[PDB]
Amino acid sequence: IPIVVRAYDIYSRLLRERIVCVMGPIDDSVASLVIAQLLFLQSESNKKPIHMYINSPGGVVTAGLAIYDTMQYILNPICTWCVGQAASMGSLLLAAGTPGMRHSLPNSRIMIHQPSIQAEEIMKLKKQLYNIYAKHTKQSLQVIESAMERDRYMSPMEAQEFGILDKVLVHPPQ
Amino acid sequence: IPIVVRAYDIYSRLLRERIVCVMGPIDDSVASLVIAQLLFLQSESNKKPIHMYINSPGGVVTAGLAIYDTMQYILNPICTWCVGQAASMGSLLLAAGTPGMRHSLPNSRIMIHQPSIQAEEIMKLKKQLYNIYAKHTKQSLQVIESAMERDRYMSPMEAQEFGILDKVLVHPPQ
Amino acid sequence: IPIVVRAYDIYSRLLRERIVCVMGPIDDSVASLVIAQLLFLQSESNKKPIHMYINSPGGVVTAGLAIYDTMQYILNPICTWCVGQAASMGSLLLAAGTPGMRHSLPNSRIMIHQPSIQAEEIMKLKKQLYNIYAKHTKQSLQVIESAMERDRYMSPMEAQEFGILDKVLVHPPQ
Amino acid sequence: IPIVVRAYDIYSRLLRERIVCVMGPIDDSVASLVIAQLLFLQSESNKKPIHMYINSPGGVVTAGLAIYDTMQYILNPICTWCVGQAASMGSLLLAAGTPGMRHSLPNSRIMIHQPSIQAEEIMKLKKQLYNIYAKHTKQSLQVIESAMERDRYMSPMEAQEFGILDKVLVHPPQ
Amino acid sequence: IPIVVRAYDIYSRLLRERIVCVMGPIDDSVASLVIAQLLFLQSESNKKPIHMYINSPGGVVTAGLAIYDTMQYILNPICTWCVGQAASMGSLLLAAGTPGMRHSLPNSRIMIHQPSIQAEEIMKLKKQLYNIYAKHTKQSLQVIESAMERDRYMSPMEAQEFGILDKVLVHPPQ
Amino acid sequence: IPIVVRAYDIYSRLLRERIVCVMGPIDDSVASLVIAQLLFLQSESNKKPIHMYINSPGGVVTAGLAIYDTMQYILNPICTWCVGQAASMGSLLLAAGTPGMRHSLPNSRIMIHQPSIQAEEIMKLKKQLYNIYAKHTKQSLQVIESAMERDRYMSPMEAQEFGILDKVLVHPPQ
Amino acid sequence: IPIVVRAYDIYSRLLRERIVCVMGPIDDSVASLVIAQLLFLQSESNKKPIHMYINSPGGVVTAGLAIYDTMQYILNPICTWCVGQAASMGSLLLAAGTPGMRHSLPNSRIMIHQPSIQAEEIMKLKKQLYNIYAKHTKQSLQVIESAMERDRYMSPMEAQEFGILDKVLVHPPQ
Amino acid sequence: IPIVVRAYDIYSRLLRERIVCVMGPIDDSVASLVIAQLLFLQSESNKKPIHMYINSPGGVVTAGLAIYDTMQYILNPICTWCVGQAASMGSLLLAAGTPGMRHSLPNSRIMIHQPSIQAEEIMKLKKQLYNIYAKHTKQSLQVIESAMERDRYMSPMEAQEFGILDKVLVHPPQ
Amino acid sequence: IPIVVRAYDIYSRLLRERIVCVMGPIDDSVASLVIAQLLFLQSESNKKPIHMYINSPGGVVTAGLAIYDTMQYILNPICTWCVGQAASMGSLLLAAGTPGMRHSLPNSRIMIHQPSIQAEEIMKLKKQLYNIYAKHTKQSLQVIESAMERDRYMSPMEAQEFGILDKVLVHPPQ
Amino acid sequence: IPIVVRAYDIYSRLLRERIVCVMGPIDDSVASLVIAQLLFLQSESNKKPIHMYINSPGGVVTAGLAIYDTMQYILNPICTWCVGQAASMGSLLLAAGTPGMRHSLPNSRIMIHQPSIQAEEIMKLKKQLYNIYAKHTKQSLQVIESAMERDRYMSPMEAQEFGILDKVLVHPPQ
Numbered sequence A, B, C, D, E, F, G, H, I, J: 001i002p003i004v005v006r007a008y009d010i011y012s013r014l015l016r017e018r019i020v021c022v023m024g025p026i027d028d029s030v031a032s033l034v035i036a037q038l039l040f041l042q043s044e045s046n047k048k049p050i051h052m053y054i055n056s057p058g059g060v061v062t063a064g065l066a067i068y069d070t071m072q073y074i075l076n077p078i079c080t081w082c083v084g085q086a087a088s089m090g091s092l093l094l095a096a097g098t099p100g101m102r103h104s105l106p107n108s109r110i111m112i113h114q115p116s117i118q119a120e121e122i123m124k125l126k127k128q129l130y131n132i133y134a135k136h137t138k139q140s141l142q143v144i145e146s147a148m149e150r151d152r153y154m155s156p157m158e159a160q161e162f163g164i165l166d167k168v169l170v171h172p173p174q
């Protein structure tokens, strides 16, 4: 994490590009940082888009739900880019983007299995996650449950036709 | 924790927005930090409100009681925002907010079970918590005990009708 | 631990409000820090009061005795504020405050039990604690020993009746 | 890691010479840093080349594939310099360089074995790697699968004739 | 590691004397740092010499080969000074210096045993080291193999007559 | 564990008195041993009763369910004696006793909270536990769910009137 | 594990009842023991059946395949009994039983997900498992794959109608 | 633990003298062993007494209560002998002995402080302990609670005066 | 590991069936035990065959070579049965069996990759392994080197075609 | 620990010579063992002497007091032999022997410092030790306190003239 050039860090100038990247497992600290960055970008401008690079092997369910609630709260359109992999919570945040701005890369893998203590609490968490999926991906609850029951990854085109993604860019279209 | 924009980081500008975030488990250090931040915001202006983002999986009983005493001591109205999950100790602070300023998010989870060496000390602490709940939630001691005896998470609407929350917002007032 | 406001840390401005915070267990380093802060505050002003916030689950006997000797040595009046829990050494430093200026929040906890290798040394230290309590709380050595034999936490009102506290404030009296 | 010469660190000036370096094992953080550096160099100039030094013993397949997708996304030609060794996951990044600009030092070691929990996921990743190698190395899928099935290190000349490298420099052009 | 004086660290000023010290075991990070320092000194001036202090108890074979390739690539004459000892890779880098500039100290010990799990890879690396020694030391492959097969250290005079060193200085000749 | 007197061990003569014991946490090995003992006692006599002492603080749900299925399969009447305590799983084993043979000592403790990765699996297991309780205790599903939702122990008389126990002996009734 | 009755152990008499118990995770040692027990029971009598109790959360794939090959090699009919739970690797052993002798208790759990570095080898093992399941359960490979692609536990009736089980007993035949 | 002389172990013959020793902390296994020994001695003879040597630094409240219930259940009179020391549970089992047979050695130490997650559970357990003490020592609940609220050790003579002991023997009756 | 019946352990009767199972990784102790068992079976009868069950994930090269030299030294024909898998040294011992007696089960996995500090020593050992394979498998050195260079598992039929096996039995000979 | 010869262990025959060796630190287990052995030797014959070899670097105060109470309780004359050393509790048990039978060896060292949580408890225990010393050694309390306050060892002759020992033997006097 070297300093890039007014003496900005690689992750400091990154946020100055309206970009909030969620790298690694999603924990309480990472969730709080992402929420703070999203709110700061909203304060800077409530109409400009905010990019979110999603590369996480999982995380906490409550953390992802808080990040999703913050994303939906702010009035900025969220462009979710799956740069790497999209685990259960990562894939949820990916699908939680604005309709028509959920992009990805050719070798990006998406997974919605949600492998997951309090039985009733986690089951109701799964129920509300199914609800969020049915809302964003424009799908039904039965198909979402059947898909999340299978422990398997999906390709960019599969995720695009299923509703998780919208576009699959290989190079900047010009 | 990158630097945002006079060379301030996330957690510094967060406190400059009259906002305090009790993130992670509540311990002696976190409790002291929250108390200092609340008192500093009071010093800045005793009239302006203070926002408290509550996302904690639990914490210490004495720490939460100290945070509650500091909140009640300062003359600033406390807007408790349940951003994520609100454990027993965090749920107390969420209920200890100003009447009419205890907000939450759609996918937030609130718990008041308080899954809790000195048996008599922790019992008196539980009684103090019952009293605080009956005071802020405008409920009785019997119902509070019955609710805190069950290990479960309440929904935003359930916590709003029970007395823990006041409003359940999805987007800012349009 | 963010930066507050000329780019002062939270704990730095804290010491600039004549406040010393004895947080967490009391050890040699914490004791040296508290002693240095007290002496520096005396240097800044020998007549202005010094506020000592006490929240500790215990500590070292010699460390608490050093802090007490430093408090008694400096001419400044020491306002001991119990914010959280006051353990053996915490409660001892609390009772060691200037008469008429020992305060505690409504839900704070006080305990002088002192749950007491050199057996004779620690016993003589215990006798010194007995004497200090008899001096400050205006109580007799017999009742002090009888109370310290019981392992329990005193409430702010109970500690005020016992002579450990002078006031139990709920809100700034105006 | 000393400071070099306006108070620039060695790795800071390194990124300031359009020179990215995938050193050590490839993980989520390292891949995120590499992607950020690549995108920042594209922002500085989308036509000037970008140098990528590869001395990695491997890493996460997802991370390397994300780095590859980022390299292919940006319009800058990527000069992949194999320094020391180019393990499986690095070898792809070494083979993914712009044609006519993939260099390697005389004593560098190249390997594409890619030693190979979700079986279907990792095997689909292996198939994607086969496709990428066939694309960049201009080789067929059968020969790539045969070469990656053998656990061995190729020499710079061997990797050059195999299509992984374009030049094997001993000294700069005289 | 104090600061020497325009507020330069001891190692920062060391690197400003055209000097790169390979201290301790040679790992990937140390190898990358040495390569970056050598290339930076080249950029500063490709004509002035570069001093390399070699004191390491071993290291990685690929790391030493990368350092050697970097040394041979840059057009700067390398003055290798053995300060304290020279392990297998250290002694190799020592012999890899410019003819007539491979100095050492009286009590400096040189070892070329190379106590070398991919067996074929390490054996091919061993053959590469044999070739490098035969090139620089101006010796044959058989004698180099016989020497590296024995696990023992060599004195500065023995290393000078064998071809590893050129001069054995005690004090600056004036 | 001394030998008692034909040179039998404590736990050996114990099983020779048709007396099985579930001590400590219930696990795969313990459950297998209990099943083997129950089947051996059935082989010895399918009509004579079998005593099951329960002093377990819990264990695996599948193990307790295996023990329960073995108890139901064997035709022997099972006298479940709650000695010390009967945690959730043990409590099921305590409730799974033959009607009119579930005994408990005065100071014994009963608890059916069942505090408990696959969400749906554990939820269906909890549903099966609800069904088993409704069957044995002659209670409804709603009351069982309400009771098991509260994390608290029950007294012998409370468990007897609730349906978990039948008799509360202090001494052998004669 | 006390001694039962000529001073036989629990697991000793268990094997003397032509009964083998695959308890806990399946490893090399456990698989070798199961194979030895099966072959010894065959030696005793090739016509008499052999009972295999299956309570395992999984284990090594090669170990389970060795157990399956031993079961199929011996001429004795294998009566599989799912007690407690039959995880993926055990489920095969449960499904590999003789047609018409695969029993399961009411609360037992069956799972065939087979959650599974030698990527190619584990995929070929998964294909062999597909073949074995298609053979024993009298189902097509497509349905077997679509079923075990989901991570879930089947009930006794579900596994019986799917082909993994034959009978679901609650009590011995009256 | 040597063999004493029909090849008896020291503990084997010890238990053959109608003597049970609760040595060390009281856990589930120790509790089960003590219960088994007591019931075996009852089986041997219900009239003859049973000697219980108590040397424990503490233990589990549930284990001590189980041992107490077993002692009260069996008709044999229990002669409690405090050897070395008697902690909370040790002293409870000591006082639980038959009246007129609770002995202790001259230098033995008795402590009933009971220094003690479920708050309500442990509190009800402490209430049960208060009741047991009031029953056996013939003391009132108020004085019992005020006594064990202090953390101190009673001498054999003091414990005899307090009602915990009946005799303090220095030598057998001459 | 129960006892089978004149009070013989399972592994004891196993060796009494002229069988020597090399289970788990091959180490010095396991190699010594296997050699001792082979020589004991030779002493019992030099004409009767000796069965060697091979289920190993790997082992030491020297250990496997010692086992091979022992197998070749004794005049008994060695029937090597691959049960579950045959790793680097396991597969070598398997191929080292007497011609016409190397058997394997349908689902067994054979691998001769031999993924193998002394470099020259291990390379000479691997050359010896090449020679042994060429001797027993009737194959040439080049093909053996090509096969062992690939990290993959051969099926029983493939290993039979490659000369490692002579038969692939599904059931005993009818 | 070999077997000596009717197939008796070294320690078993040692205990059969009326000898109890308190070897190593004195803990609850060793204390119970010594008490049991002493009582067994009493049961065998209350007139014959009992030898006690004392070689321990310390132990527990309560354990030593229990051993002392057992020694004084039994009517057998205790011959305490100091073999190698005598720590605080070891030296106490040594002095606790019968007058005229407290022997030792030439190079045996005696220490009575007693370097010693519960301050008041250990203080009263050390007072009891003072009393025991004054009783057995025929000395006063002041001298005993002054001696135990010094952290130093004593020679056999010093301990004999002080009262701890009675004789200092080198060879059996004949």
Ligand SMILES: C[C@@H]1Cc2nc(NCc3ccc(Br)cc3)[nH]c(=O)c2CN1Cc1cccc(C#N)c1
Pocket: A035, A036, A037, A039, A040, A042, A043, A069, A070, A073, B010, B013, B014, B017, B019, B051, B053, B081, B083
């Ligand atoms: C109203 C309350 C206060 C507030 N304050 C500002 N100030 C701008 C700002 C925030 C943060 C940084 Br860093 C820098 C500048 N902007 C807002 O959007 C909010 C909203 N809050 C409600 C709310 C809603 C949903 C999720 C969360 C959460 N977590 C909180």
Ligand SMILES: C[C@@H]1Cc2nc(NCc3ccc(Br)cc3)[nH]c(=O)c2CN1Cc1cccc(C#N)c1
Pocket: B035, B036, B037, B039, B040, B042, B043, B069, B070, B073, C010, C013, C014, C017, C051, C053, C081, C083, C105
């Ligand atoms: C009177 C005593 C001193 C004092 N000092 C100031 N100065 C402002 C200030 C405080 C902190 C930072 Br950082 C920056 C500026 N402001 C106050 O509100 C208090 C109140 N204190 C009593 C008190 C009451 C309740 C909880 C606690 C606690 N813990 C302490």
Ligand SMILES: C[C@@H]1Cc2nc(NCc3ccc(Br)cc3)[nH]c(=O)c2CN1Cc1cccc(C#N)c1
Pocket: C035, C036, C037, C039, C040, C042, C043, C069, C070, C073
């Ligand atoms: C006389 C000796 C020197 C001295 N020096 C100053 N200078 C002011 C100062 C101190 C510290 C910081 Br940071 C900044 C400014 N002020 C004093 O009060 C003392 C007293 N000392 C005696 C003494 C008494 C009791 C406890 C301790 C202790 N520990 C030491």
Ligand SMILES: C[C@@H]1Cc2nc(NCc3ccc(Br)cc3)[nH]c(=O)c2CN1Cc1cccc(C#N)c1
Pocket: A010, A013, A014, A017, A019, A051, A053, A081, A083, D035, D036, D037, D039, D040, D042, D043, D069, D070, D073
């Ligand atoms: C459109 C989206 C936003 C964006 N923003 C800028 N700004 C320049 C800049 C970036 C970073 C630093 Br540090 C400094 C300056 N430049 C871009 O190339 C992209 C592309 N993004 C899409 C995209 C494509 C492929 C991989 C990833 C990833 N990870 C993301």
Ligand SMILES: C[C@@H]1Cc2nc(NCc3ccc(Br)cc3)[nH]c(=O)c2CN1Cc1cccc(C#N)c1
Pocket: D010, D013, D014, D017, D019, D051, D053, D081, D083, D105, E035, E036, E037, E039, E040, E042, E043, E069, E070, E073
């Ligand atoms: C051509 C490529 C880019 C390049 N860039 C510059 N710029 C100067 C500079 C470098 C680094 C720092 Br810090 C500061 C200033 N100078 C060069 O010598 C090289 C050579 N590279 C090829 C190359 C050859 C041998 C080993 C490695 C390696 N590892 C890489």
Ligand SMILES: C[C@@H]1Cc2nc(NCc3ccc(Br)cc3)[nH]c(=O)c2CN1Cc1cccc(C#N)c1
Pocket: F035, F036, F037, F039, F040, F042, F043, F069, F070, F073, G010, G013, G014, G017, G019, G051, G053, G081, G083, G105
């Ligand atoms: C029919 C099958 C074979 C069998 N064999 C005997 N033999 C007596 C015996 C068993 C064990 C010892 Br040790 C000593 C003597 N007795 C039986 O009850 C059963 C029942 N089995 C079915 C079954 C039912 C429920 C749970 C499990 C389980 N786990 C297994």
Ligand SMILES: C[C@@H]1Cc2nc(NCc3ccc(Br)cc3)[nH]c(=O)c2CN1Cc1cccc(C#N)c1
Pocket: G035, G036, G037, G039, G040, G042, G043, G069, G070, G073, I010, I013, I014, I017, I051, I053, I081, I083, I105
């Ligand atoms: C022919 C070969 C030798 C042999 N020997 C006997 N003896 C009886 C016996 C075995 C074991 C104990 Br313990 C006690 C008595 N009985 C047999 O079934 C076999 C079969 N063998 C082939 C074979 C097939 C499948 C899996 C494995 C494996 N692993 C091995």
Ligand SMILES: C[C@@H]1Cc2nc(NCc3ccc(Br)cc3)[nH]c(=O)c2CN1Cc1cccc(C#N)c1
Pocket: F010, F013, F014, F017, F019, F051, F053, F081, F083, F105, H035, H036, H037, H039, H040, H042, H043, H069, H070, H073
């Ligand atoms: C009636 C039930 C069965 C029974 N069986 C016998 N047999 C004698 C015996 C027991 C053990 C060994 Br070892 C050797 C011979 N004797 C009895 O006292 C009891 C009493 N039971 C009830 C009961 C009461 C209190 C605590 C517990 C407990 N834990 C259990």
Ligand SMILES: C[C@@H]1Cc2nc(NCc3ccc(Br)cc3)[nH]c(=O)c2CN1Cc1cccc(C#N)c1
Pocket: I035, I036, I037, I039, I040, I042, I043, I069, I070, I073
């Ligand atoms: C001659 C030497 C002594 C000897 N002794 C006997 N006695 C039979 C016997 C051996 C072992 C047990 Br257990 C029980 C009975 N039988 C022999 O085969 C050998 C051969 N030895 C040479 C030799 C050759 C190859 C590998 C090794 C090895 N390791 C050793």
Ligand SMILES: C[C@@H]1Cc2nc(NCc3ccc(Br)cc3)[nH]c(=O)c2CN1Cc1cccc(C#N)c1
Pocket: H010, H013, H014, H017, H051, H053, H081, H083, H105, J035, J036, J037, J039, J040, J042, J043, J069, J070, J073
């Ligand atoms: C009266 C009570 C029962 C009793 N029983 C016998 N039986 C002989 C015997 C004991 C043990 C083995 Br092993 C073998 C044979 N002999 C006795 O001395 C005692 C004395 N007891 C009281 C007592 C006094 C002092 C310390 C402790 C202690 N700890 C206990």
